[PDB]
Amino acid sequence: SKLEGSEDSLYSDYVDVFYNTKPYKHRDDRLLQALMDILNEEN
């Protein structure tokens, strides 16, 4: 066991969430989408 069915550290996620680390490159395309809007009302 412990290696069949995505059973690799299921609780390890609870820790990482406490580190506040995940979006280092992008993860959630929000910052970029914000710049596109800047020109939405400026033609």
Swiss-Prot record:
Coiled coil ranges: none
Taxonomy, superkingdom: Eukaryota
Subcellular location: Cytoplasmic vesicle, Secretory vesicle
Disrupted-gene phenotype: Increase in unprocessed AGRP.
Family: Belongs to the peptidase S8 family. Furin subfamily.
Biological role stated in the UniProt entry: Involved in the processing of hormone and other protein precursors at sites comprised of pairs of basic amino acid residues. Substrates include POMC, renin, enkephalin, dynorphin, somatostatin, insulin and AGRP.
Name of the protein this chain belongs to: Neuroendocrine convertase 1
Source organism: Mus musculus (Mouse)
Residue span relative to the full protein: 711 to 753 of 753
